[PDB]
């Protein structure tokens, strides 16, 4: 079983955090007090750490959430400290003398460390298995912390507003406004010159910053970026494995949304392109299955053309 994570897991310790602070990793949260000094048995990999201070001294059950990504290693130890001055976590590197004393003490500190709940790992992996260190290093803010409410800006890739090349004729304006493949490739080659599928990690990064960081402007980027991908029909012939992975990324992302329209439209276009006879057969079989899944779940007919696209049927002899 997964008892091996007691020995092989990573540990995050936070020093001098005020009682009542909200602190967590991935989908897991703890209330902070003297009996809680961090998290043990953390599966190695990339993880999202978050926290909110108290509202206005006396808890009003609020505080703007802050967060940061950490690459955690087998038997790793991270020592974070609270800044009283700033009311935030200080990511400044702990002196290795301070870290080694802390590790010598883990045996006694274990009573004060919440075990990372393994039952939430599988869902966290489904949302992040394409985020790499390169992704975090590229997208995270200048001072590495993401905030619900100035050096905190997520460094998302610039997305084009104009979908067609400069000087395009009306017919080319039309072609490239309907198929965003030219637009998508302009982004791929600038951001990910040698590995286009890195765009998939940036799409998980944005979704996490929204869903778990409550950063709305990362939801908007997720929307813009997803739109660029789903309306890029030619691109599905070119970057076929990229799109096979996008379906699985999207099945887990949409599984975390209640569907409170922008998604119904872009996904209709995506399924039209991904389910055609034109594309690689494994993409089509996978897009087919995802379409049926999405239909049953959201009670929508993603396989239907939009109503306003039907021709007039004219009766004539």
């Amino acid at each position: 079983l997964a008892k091996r994570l007691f020995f092989e897991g990573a540990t995050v310790v936070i020093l001098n955090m005020p009682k009542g602070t909200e602190f967590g990793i991935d989908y897991n949260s703890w209330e902070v007090g003297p009996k809680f000094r961090g998290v043990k048995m953390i599966p190695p990999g990339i993880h999202f750490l978050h926290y909110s201070s108290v509202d206005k001294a006396n808890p009003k059950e609020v505080g703007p959430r802050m967060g940061f990504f950490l690459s955690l290693h087998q038997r790793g130890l991270t020592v974070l400290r609270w800044s009283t001055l700033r009311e935030e976590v200080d990511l400044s590197p702990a002196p290795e003398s301070e870290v080694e004393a802390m590790r010598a003490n883990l045996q006694e500190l274990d009573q004060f460390l919440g075990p990372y709940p393994y039952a939430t790992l599988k869902k966290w992996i489904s949302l992040t298995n394409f985020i790499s260190e390169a992704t975090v290093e590229k997208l995270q803010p200048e001072n590495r912390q993401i905030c619900a409410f100035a050096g905190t800006e997520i460094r998302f890739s610039e997305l084009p507003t104009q979908m067609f090349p400069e000087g395009a004729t009306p017919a080319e304006i039309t072609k490239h406004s309907m198929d965003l493949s030219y637009a998508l490739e302009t982004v791929l080659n600038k951001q990910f010159p040698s590995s286009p599928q890195d765009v998939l990690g940036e799409l998980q990064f944005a979704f996490v910053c929204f869903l778990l960081g409550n950063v709305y402007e990362a939801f908007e980027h997720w929307k813009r970026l997803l739109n660029l991908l789903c309306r890029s029909e030619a691109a599905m012939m070119k970057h076929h494995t990229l799109y096979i992975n996008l379906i699985s990324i999207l099945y887990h992302q949409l599984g975390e949304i209640p569907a409170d329209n922008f998604l119904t439209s872009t996904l209709q276009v995506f399924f039209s392109s991904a389910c055609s006879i034109a594309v690689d057969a494994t993409l089509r079989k996978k897009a087919e299955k995802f379409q049926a899944h999405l239909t049953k779940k959201f009670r929508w007919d993603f396989a239907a053309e939009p109503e306003d696209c039907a021709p007039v049927v004219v009766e004539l002899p």
Binding site: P170, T174, M178, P306, D308, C309, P311, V312, V313, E315
Partner: protein, 257 residues
Amino acid sequence: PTEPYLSSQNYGELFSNQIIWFVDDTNVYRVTIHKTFEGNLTTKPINGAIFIFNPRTGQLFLKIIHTSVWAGQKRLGQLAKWKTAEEVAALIRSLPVEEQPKQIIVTRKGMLDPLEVHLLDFPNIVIKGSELQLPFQACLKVEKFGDLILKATEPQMVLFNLYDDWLKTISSYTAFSRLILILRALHVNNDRAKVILKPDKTTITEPHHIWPTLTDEEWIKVEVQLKDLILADYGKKNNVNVASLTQSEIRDIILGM
């Protein structure tokens, strides 16, 4: 962010100083029933048209959409919207500056984005939709128009004027109301309404006109009947058939709520 639209409160702007076009894309993608060589029923595309209409002058720009523009194309439904916007843009470019529209009002919301994209070089044009459901799509039930479109062999722009010689004797508002009444009647039922437009076996429409030549009282007669034909369709459709709700509630009916 403001989101303008033609509504019951502002529709007086149609007749104000500025230049306004209605653009209806409804009839640019049309098909008919067709029998394959192998004897199976399917559809095939026939010609369509863009209706571009100035409500203050009656001026109609009827851009005929020949089926050649669909040849070897996919998703004609989506493409039709973008084809319409190309043509509206090409039309605006050919006009001198003081003749370009200040506002474009579309009948169908799918036209807003393609128009915005193709009119990016005309930043001062308002592009918006309409709360009034105006039955401009019934323009091709006018046989002069339906037949010219059906039989066109090549793309062409043909200019008309939907107000014939009325503007010598009535205002643009009255002229517009009369046109929408006819169109809504032709939309309600072609046959009953074409009858009503020929009150007399000698009533003839001129060669250069669109609508029958009628006296001032005949027009009164025809407009009463077209009202009754429209309202009898509302009652039968909505099963709340009264002469009881009509205190300029009819104004809502005739114009489209």
